[PDB]
Amino acid sequence: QCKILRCNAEYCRALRSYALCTRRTARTCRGDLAFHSAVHGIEDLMIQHNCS
Amino acid sequence: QCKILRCNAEYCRALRSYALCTRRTARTCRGDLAFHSAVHGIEDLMIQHNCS
Amino acid sequence: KARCSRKALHVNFKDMGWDDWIIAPLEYEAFHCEGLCEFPLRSHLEPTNHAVIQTLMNSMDPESTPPTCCVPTRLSPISILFIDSANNVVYKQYEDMVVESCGCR
Amino acid sequence: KARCSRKALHVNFKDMGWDDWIIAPLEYEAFHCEGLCEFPLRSHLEPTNHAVIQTLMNSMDPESTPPTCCVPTRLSPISILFIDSANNVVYKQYEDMVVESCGCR
């Protein structure tokens, strides 16, 4: 099963942890809207302010 | 079936119409929360401002 | 301002004049939902696809779409012993009476 | 300020960078919910008992409890043809994508 919600619990270091968690759970999420939405949110939060 | 929602469509004359509709549909509503809530609301709106 | 969560809501039937037909119980904890609905949506249960899409759109362009709202997503029933219109004492299990979890929709 | 009703919400997948994996459709009308939640609750479908109780309590003492919120109560699915992680073209029926009715909860 897709474990995208497990990454939202612990949540620029937090953004990297979120990204690593999404990478780890990217296998079972073949086509889930929450996964792509979380990826887009991580990207938007990394671009915002100043992160790298 | 309880027809309490049918009275909320047409809605101090409107308050009297609401009361008459609730009286008309009071048979099938043996114990429905929406019926008692609508009666309490009619009473609160009649007491408010100036109605009789 | 905190995220969407569950707060207290002590319903008292005597405060509504419903004690004339309700025998027991006369009060109970029903809870309610309140809190911010921001990105991402953190919830034990998975949000609806529409809620995800609308929250993402509000995160993108907040000027366009309004955010989702904190509302109950799971509820449990309670039993009520009351007197119906026929002067009968009825034990009825009313559904959707107690909020068990809140979410953004 | 009007009561709880359904408004437009044109979702465009190109605006979210999702066109890289979504083939069709690229945009659709998802609608959303907005409006006042006052007494009484006027809706084609019957509100939950908890929504009725909370709206009545807000009508009684608004200082105590916050009002209910306008959220979707019926939704319909849409079909999406996309490319999953295994380079396969999948036709999937995503549920809860289009709001068909709004209500106060």
Author numbering:
A (entry chain B), B (entry chain B): 36 to 46, 80 to 120
C (entry chain A), D (entry chain A): 397 to 501
Please share text taken word for word from the publication where this structure appeared.
We also determined the structures of the RGMAND–GDF5 and RGMCND–GDF5 complexes. However, while the GDF5 structure in the three complexes is largely invariant, the relative orientation of the three RGMND helix bundles towards GDF5 differs. The relative position of the α3 helix differs by ∼5 Å in RGMBND–GDF5 and RGMCND–GDF5 complexes, with its N terminus being the anchor point for a rotation of RGMND. The pivot point seems to be RGMB Leu103 (RGMA Leu97, RGMC Leu101). A relative rotation around this leucine permits the side-chain of the preceding arginine (Arg100 in RGMB) to be inserted between GDF5 fingers 1 and 2 in the RGMA– and RGMB–GDF5 complexes. In the RGMCND–GDF5 complex, however, this arginine side-chain is placed above finger 2, potentially explaining the different arrangements of the RGM α3 helix. Strikingly, the superposition of GDF5-bound RGMBND and RGMCND requires translation by 5.6 Å and rotation by 15.4°. Intriguingly, mutations in the α2–α3 linker of RGMC (Gly99Val, Gly99Arg, Leu101Pro) cause iron overload and impair interactions with the closely related BMP2 (17). GDF5 interacted similarly with RGMCND (Kd 3.9 μM) and weaker with RGMAND (Kd 16.7 μM). The juvenile hemochromatosis-causing mutation, Gly99Arg, in RGMCND and a corresponding mutation, Gly101Arg, in RGMBND attenuated the interactions with GDF5, Kd > 20 μM and > 150 μM, respectively.
